[PDB]
Amino acid sequence: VTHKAVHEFVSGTPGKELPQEVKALLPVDQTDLKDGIQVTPTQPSQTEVKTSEGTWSFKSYDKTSETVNGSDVKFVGTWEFTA
Numbered sequence: 001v002t003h004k005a006v007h008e009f010v011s012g013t014p015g016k017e018l019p020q021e022v023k024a025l026l027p028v029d030q031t032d033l034k035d036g037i038q039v040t041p042t043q044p045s046q047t048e049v050k051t052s053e054g055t056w057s058f059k060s061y062d063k064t065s066e067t068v069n070g071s072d073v074k075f076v077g078t079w080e081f082t083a
Contacts, residue, residue: 005073041075057069
């Protein structure tokens with residue numbers, strides 16, 4: 001069975017939604033995986049996004065890796081906002 005790894009971004013700053021400029025940095029899925037394969041999340045191409053109101057900074061993903069075992073993988077990446 002082939003599997004994939006996908007990415008999701010969240011805001012780490014309560015009350016503040018991610019803007020399109022940050023969402024657009026979401027990496028593409030990693031494809032063609034099989035059970036037994038280790039995966040590492042793709043880095044966002046930029047880790048800092050400046051806005052009129054402040055800065056979004058990429059903190060980290062929730063995991064540094066996952067080894068595929070029967071399911072597709074999701075890595076959740078957190079951005080923090082400072083005004």
